[PDB]
Design a protein around this nucleic acid. Structure first.
Ligand code: LFX
Ligand code: LFX
Ligand code: MG
Ligand code: MG
Lengths: 481, 222, 481, 222
DNA sequence: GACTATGCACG
DNA sequence: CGTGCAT
DNA sequence: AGTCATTCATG
DNA sequence: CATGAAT
C-alpha cells in the first residue's frame, strides 16, 4: 500500500507525459491537413453524422455531446469554443463550420452558448474529408476502443497555409497567418513540376499572407525571411481614407484593421488618446459599423493635423501592429519549425500517399467486382445445371462446395451466385454483363497506371488541385507594400 | 448594463427589450446603432403585480429600465425613447415574458402605453430555403403566409421552424424584425382601463383561486 | 408594418398559451405513466439510443445533447438536472437512471456537470418502455417534424404512485409521495377483480406512502383523507435511538430523516439550537455519516433531559415536519385533482388499451407471416413451373404479375416468392413450413382471445403485474404509526 | 473553501488535494470524516517557479493550502496533518497538476517532503465487470494487473478505461484510493537535492530554451 | 449565462 | 498586454 | 464549474 | 423558508 519515488523521477515522468501530449495531441497543427486534434475530431464527427453543408443545420449541443462521447475526452466548452472559432470569417480565411446564431464578432462579444446555436460543416470542409472512406489515411482507436478515428485527414487543399494556426504548447508555440487559397494552390502546383523550386520563384506565386480582415502588410524582405526560416516580423497597418467635412473639417476613416485585434477596444483606445490629449488633431471618435461593413470615423476639428495625427495613432494604438511568423507544425510526430518549402513538400508527399491509397482501394474493389462478373458470365452458360445442382444440395454451404468442386467457381463467386434472388433469373443477358466487364477492366488499367507511374500520379494531383482552385478561389483582401 | 444609441433623440429612438443576454448580443450586432438601443433581460422578469415595492426597485432589470428610460415611476413622461419594443422568442416562455413586462409597464409606466409607445416585435416563425453558394431563403409569420411560400418555393424546398431568437443571425434579425422599413411590430393600446386592470390582476396577481377559474373557463386543453 | 392590439387581448392570449403549456407540457405528470414530458423524453431517448442497463454507461453530455437536438427544445441544464434527479435513491423510491460520478447527496451538494458523469437507464425503467415498438401507445411529431415521440409510455408498473411527483405550474401544483412498488401493485390487482373497490379495503393493501428516506409517518386518518380527496397533512418524524455514554452521559441518535430535507442543514440547525441554548439538554452535535449509512449524533451532557430535549427538536427543527398530499395529474389533457381510486382506475384502463394494441399488433404480424407461409407451402407443389415462369418473365414486376394471374398468388405472396434467394431452394420441406403454420395459427387464436374477452385480457394484466412484483419488490422503509 | 476533519490530530490526519470541485465533492462523500480533510483545487495551480512572490501569496489555492496546513512558508513544521495526499486524474492534465503542486511544496514547504509527508494517490486505471442485479466488478492499476483480471473474468467481461475521477462514485473512491487498508499511495522522497533543484528549474522554470532541449533530448515522440 | 484564475510561448 | 486548447 | 435571480403554487 | 422544470 506504499511505493516510494524521488521527486526527481516523478517530475520527469509526469512533465514528460504532459509535454508530449500538449505538443502532439493538443496545441500544435499537423503539417499535412493543418489541423489540431480537436478540430479534426469536430470535422470528422460532424461528417460521420451526416451534418454537412447541403443538409439542415443541427443543434450545436448535439454535435458537441457527440464529439465528446465518441472522440474527444475533454470539456464541452473546449470543443464548442473551438467549433465557434472555425465558424468566424474574421479569424479563418476559409470558414470550416457554418453556424446559426450569435457566434461572436470583431468587437469581441461572447458567442452564444451551445444550447442556442446550430451548426453544420461548410462546403469546403467537405473537401478536407474527401475520400476518407476509401482507406486513404491512417486510422486509430478512440479512448473507448469502440470506434476508429483518423489521425490525419485527406486534405484536398492545403489547409495549413490557407487558414493558418496558433499555437501554444510546452517548449514550442505556433503562429501561422492565413493565406489566399488560390495562391497557395498555385505554388504547390509549381512545386509539383519543379520539386527543387527555390523560394524566390515560389514567392512569385505565393507572396505574403492574406488576412481575412484585409488591411495592409509591409515587409517583403521580412516575409522572405519567414518563408525561408520560419520566423519574421511583418508590419500590419489598418486601411485608411480621408473625408472632407462641410465646414473646413477633415475626417479620418478606417475600413480594415489588423488581424486578431478587438475592434471595440481599438476604438476605445483611439478615444482614450483624445481624452488625455496625447495628440492635438483630436476631435470626436465614432464607431459606425453595422451588419455588412466596418467603418471607424475619427473626425478632427479645425487645425486638421491629419497626416501628423494619423501617424501618431499608427505608433501608439493598434491601428498599426506587427505580426510574427513562428511556423511550427507536427512533422513525423514531432514539432518542427518550418518555412514554406517543407510545408508545401510534405503536403504534396501527403497527397501522393492519399492518391495512391485511394487508387489501391478503388482497384481492389473493381477486381473483386470483375471476378464476380466473370463468374456470372459463366453461370449463364450452364444455368439449368447450376440451378439443379443447387436444388440438389443440402444448404447454403453445401451448394457452395458443390459449385466449387463441380464447376471450379471460387468461394467468392459461389457465394455471389448462391445469394442471387429469384427475380434475377428474369435477366440472363451475357451482353449487359460483358459491358460492365469492359468498363471495369478499363477502370483497373487506369488505376494501375496512376499507381505505377509517378508522372501520371502527379498529373492527377495537379488536375485535382486546379479543380479546387476554380471552385473556391477568392480575391486577395490584404495588400502588399 | 445597456448598449446605447449613438445619439440622443427622444423623437426617433428605440429601446429594444430582448429576452436573453445572447439574443441581446445578436441584436447589438445587427442593428442601426445611430438610433436603437439594446437592453437584454436575463431570465424571467419580476412579476410586479405580485411582490412588494421593496423587491421591485431592488431588482436589476426593473431599475435599469427605469434609469435608461428616464421618466421615473411619479412617472412624468417625455425623456427618452419614442419606442419601447419588446422582442422575445415566439414560444411559450417568450409569451410569458411579454405578460410580465406588460404588467410592469401597465402598473408603473402607464402613460407610456396610453400614448402608444410600447410595441411587441414579431419574429418570423418560419424560414424557407432551396445547396451551398446558391441557397435561397424566405420568411413567413403565419399559417397562411407559409402556405404562400411553399407553393412558390415548391417541392425540394425545406422549412425551418424557428424555436427562438438564438437560432438566427444578426443580418437576419435586421432584415426580418429590426429594420423599420421591413419589420412588423404590434402596438399595444388599451381600450378601456377597468377591463384591463381586472384582467391583469386576475392573471398576474397574488390570489390564485380566480386564476385557476379563469384557466378552467378559458384555456381549452381539449 | 404595424398592428394594434389591446393590452387586454395580448395578456389573455399570451398568458393562455403559457399556462396551457406549463400545465400539460411542463410541470405536471401524466396520470398513466407518472411522467413529466422531460422525463419521458429522457427515457425515450436513452432507450432509442440503446443506452440501457445491460450495456456500458454513456457520457451524460452525449445523452443530453441528443435529447435536446431531437426531442426537447429547452436548455441542457434543465434536461441534465432532471436526469440527475431520476438517478437519486433518496428522491425516487425506484431510481430510473443510473449515474456514475458525483450526482449530489442528501447534504445537498452540487452534482457534477454533464461533462464528468456517465449514465444509463436502470433496469426497471426498461419496464416503463416495454412494448413501445409494438404500436401500443400514441405517437406525435417532434418540433423538427423529423421524428416521432411517445405522448405516454406503456408503463408496465404504476410509476405515478411509486416514484410520486412534484409539482409547480400555473393555477395548479402537484405533490405526490413515493409508494412501495409491491403494495401499489397489490391494490391495482385487487381493483382489477373488484372494480368498485371502496377506499377502505384498498388501504388494507396500500396504506400510507413509503419514503426512500424511510422515517416514521403518522396520520392514518389524514392518509385516508388524502387517498379519498387528493389532499391531506401527514406527520413525518425522523427515526431515533438512544445510546448510553460511558460516564453518565446519554446520546441521541438519528438514522432516518424526513423526505426532501437537507441533512447538512438539519444538522446545522440542531447545532444552532445548542449555541443559542434554546433548550437545556444541549451538548455536542456531530454528523457521522459515511458512504453506506446515515448517522446523526446529538449527545447530551449531565442533566440528561433526553425525552424533554428530543421533544423540543421535533417541534423547532425539521427532525419532524409535515408532508402535504396535493395529488394533481393530467387526465384527458387537463389537470385533475385525484385520490387513489381515479389514479388506479386510469392506470388499469391504460394497460387495457396497451395490452389490446399490443395484441392487435402481434396478431397482424402473425396473419401476415401466415399468409406468406401458406403461399410457400403451395409454391413447393409447383416449384418447377414457378421457377420456369419466373425465368420466362421480363423483370421483378412482370414475374409478380404472372404468378398472380397464372397461379392466383397475392401481391404479398408473389413478392415473397420472387425475392427468395437461390440457396433457399436447397430446402423444399412442406413439413417444416406446416409446423410454423400451426404455431402461427395458435398465436393468432390466443391473441383473438385476449382481444375479444375482457376477462382473459384482465387476467393477462394481472399475470404481468405480478411478474413485475416478484422481480422488483423491496421491503418498506417508512413505518406507519 | 475546505472540508475539515471532525477532530484535530497532527498525528493521523489526511489532507487530500483533489483536482476538481467536482471530484472534491465525491471525495467529501466517500471518506472517513473522522480524520480526512478535503481541499479541491479549481483548475490549474499557479506555477510557483515562474511568477513573482506577490502573485503567489495573492492566489486563492496557495493561500488556503498554507492556512489549512499551518506551518507557513519560514515554514516551521509540525501543525497540522501527517499526510498531504495529491489526488488527481490519471491523465495528462492530472500529471501536469502533480508537477505544479510538487514544485510548490518543493520550493516553499520543503521540509514537508523531506520528512516524507507528501503522497500521490493512484486511482485505478481500469474496471472490469460481468447484467443488472448481479454485476461483478474488479479494479486494476497496470498493464500486468489488467492481464491478470481479464483471464479471471474471462470472456464476456467488459473493460472500462477510467478517463478521470469524475467517472467514479464515492464508495468506489473509498474502496480503491482513499481507504487506508486498501489504498495504494506513492510517497515522494528526495534523493539528493541539487539534482532535484536543477530538474525542477529546467522543467518548471521561466527560461524555456533549456526546457525545449530537455524535451528534444528526453521526450521520445517516436 | 456572465464573471471569475491558472498553464504554455512570446513579443 | 492577449492569443487558444486545457483545467 | 460555483454564484448569482426570477416564474409558478403552497404551507 | 424551499420544492423543480423553465428562463
Ligand atoms: C475548472 C473550472 C473551475 O474554475 C474555473 C474558474 N475559476 C478560476 C480559478 N478558481 C480558483 C476560481 C474559479 C474560471 F475562472 C474559469 C473556468 C472555466 O472557464 C471553465 C471552463 O470549463 O472552461 C471551468 N472552470 C473555471
Ligand atoms: C438565464 C441565464 C442568465 O441568468 C441566470 C442567473 N442570473 C444572472 C443575473 N440575473 C438578472 C438573474 C440571475 C442565475 F442566477 C441563474 C441562471 C441559470 O441557472 C441558468 C441556467 O441555465 O439554468 C441560466 N441563467 C441564469
Ligand atoms: Mg425559447
Ligand atoms: Mg481529465
Amino acid at each position: 500500500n506504499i511505493q516510494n519515488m524521488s521527486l526527481e523521477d516523478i517530475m520527469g515522468e509526469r512533465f514528460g507525459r504532459y509535454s508530449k501530449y500538449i505538443i502532439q495531441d493538443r496545441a500544435l497543427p499537423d503539417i499535412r491537413d493543418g489541423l489540431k486534434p480537436v478540430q479534426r475530431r469536430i470535422l470528422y464527427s460532424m461528417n460521420k453524422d451526416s451534418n454537412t453543408f447541403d443538409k439542415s443545420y443541427r443543434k450545436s449541443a448535439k454535435s458537441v455531446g457527440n464529439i465528446m462521447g465518441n472522440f474527444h475526452p475533454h470539456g464541452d466548452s473546449s470543443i464548442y469554443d473551438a467549433m465557434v472559432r472555425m465558424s468566424q470569417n474574421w479569424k479563418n480565411r476559409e470558414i470550416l463550420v457554418e453556424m446559426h446564431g450569435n457566434n461572436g464578432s470583431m468587437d469581441g462579444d461572447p458567442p452564444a452558448a451551445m444550447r442556442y446555436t446550430e451548426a453544420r460543416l461548410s462546403e469546403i470542409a467537405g473537401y478536407l474529408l474527401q475520400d476518407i472512406e476509401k482507406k486513404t489515411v491512417p486510422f486509430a482507436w478512440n479512448f473507448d476502443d469502440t470506434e476508429k478515428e483518423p489521425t490525419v485527414l485527406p486534405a484536398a487543399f492545403p489547409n495549413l497555409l490557407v487558414n493558418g494556426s496558433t499555437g501554444i504548447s510546452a517548449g514550442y508555440a505556433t503562429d501561422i497567418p492565413p493565406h489566399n487559397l488560390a495562391e497557395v494552390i498555385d505554388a504547390a502546383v509549381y512545386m509539383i513540376d519543379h520539386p527543387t523550386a527555390k523560394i524566390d520563384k515560389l514567392m512569385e506565386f505565393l507572396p505574403g499572407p492574406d488576412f481575412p480582415t484585409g488591411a495592409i502588410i509591409q515587409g517583403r524582405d521580412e516575409i522572405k525571411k519567414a518563408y525561408e526560416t520560419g520566423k519574421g516580423r511583418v508590419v500590419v497597418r489598418s486601411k485608411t481614407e480621408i473625408e472632407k467635412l462641410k465646414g473646413g473639417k477633415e475626417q479620418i476613416v478606417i475600413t480594415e484593421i489588423p488581424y486578431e485585434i478587438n475592434k471595440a477596444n481599438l476604438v476605445k483606445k483611439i478615444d482614450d488618446v483624445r481624452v488625455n490629449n496625447k495628440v492635438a488633431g483630436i476631435a470626436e471618435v465614432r464607431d459606425e459599423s453595422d451588419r455588412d461593413g466596418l467603418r471607424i470615423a475619427i473626425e478632427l476639428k479645425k487645425d486638421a493635423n491629419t497626416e501628423l495625427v494619423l501617424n501618431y495613432l499608427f505608433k501608439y494604438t493598434d491601428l498599426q501592429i506587427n505580426y510574427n511568423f513562428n511556423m511550427v507544425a507536427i512533422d513525423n510526430f514531432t514539432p518542427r519549425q518550418v518555412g514554406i518549402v517543407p510545408i508545401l513538400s510534405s503536403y504534396i508527399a501527403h497527397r501522393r500517399e492519399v492518391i495512391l491509397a485511394r487508387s489501391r482501394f478503388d482497384k481492389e474493389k473493381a477486381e473483386k467486382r470483375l471476378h464476380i462478373v466473370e463468374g456470372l458470365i459463366r453461370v449463364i452458360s450452364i444455368l439449368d445445371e447450376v440451378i439443379a445442382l443447387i436444388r440438389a444440395s443440402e444448404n447454403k454451404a453445401d451448394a457452395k462446395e458443390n459449385l466449387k468442386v463441380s464447376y471450379d467457381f471460387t468461394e467468392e463467386q459461389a457465394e455471389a451466385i448462391v445469394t442471387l434472388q429469384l427475380y434475377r433469373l428474369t435477366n440472363t443477358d451475357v451482353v449487359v454483363l460483358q459491358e460492365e466487364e469492359a468498363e471495369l477492366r478499363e477502370k483497373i488499367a487506369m488505376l494501375a497506371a496512376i499507381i505505377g507511374d509517378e508522372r501520371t500520379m502527379y498529373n492527377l494531383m495537379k488536375k485535382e488541385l486546379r479543380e479546387v482552385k476554380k471552385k473556391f478561389a477568392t480575391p486577395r483582401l490584404s495588400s502588399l507594400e | 448594463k445597456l448598449t446605447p444609441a449613438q445619439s440622443k433623440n427622444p423623437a426617433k429612438n428605440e429601446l429594444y427589450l430582448v429576452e436573453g443576454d445572447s439574443a441581446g448580443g445578436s441584436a447589438k450586432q445587427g442593428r442601426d446603432r445611430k438610433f436603437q438601443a439594446i437592453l437584454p433581460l436575463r431570465g424571467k422578469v419580476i412579476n410586479t403585480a405580485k411582490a412588494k415595492m421593496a423587491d421591485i426597485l431592488k431588482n436589476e432589470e426593473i431599475n435599469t429600465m427605469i434609469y435608461t428610460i428616464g421618466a421615473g415611476v411619479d412617472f412624468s413622461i417625455e425623456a427618452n425613447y419614442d419606442k419601447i419594443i419588446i422582442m422575445t422568442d415566439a414560444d411559450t416562455d417568450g409569451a410569458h415574458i411579454q405578460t410580465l413586462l406588460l404588467t410592469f409597464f401597465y402598473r408603473y409606466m402607464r402613460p407610456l402605453v396610453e400614448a402608444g409607445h410600447v410595441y411587441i416585435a414579431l419574429p418570423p416563425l418560419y424560414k424557407m430555403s432551396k445547396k451551398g453558394k446558391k441557397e435561397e431563403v424566405a420568411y413567413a409569420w403565419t399559417d397562411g403566409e407559409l402556405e404562400e411560400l411553399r407553393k412558390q418555393f415548391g417541392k425540394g424546398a425545406t422549412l425551418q421552424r424557428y424555436k427562438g431568437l438564438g437560432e438566427m443571425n444578426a443580418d437576419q434579425l435586421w432584415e426580418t424584425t429590426m429594420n423599420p422599413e421591413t419589420r412588423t411590430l404590434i402596438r399595444v393600446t388599451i381600450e378601456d382601463l377597468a377591463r384591463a386592470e381586472r384582467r391583469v390582476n386576475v392573471l398576474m396577481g397574488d390570489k390564485v383561486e380566480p386564476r385557476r377559474k379563469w384557466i378552467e373557463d378559458n384555456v381549452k386543453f381539449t
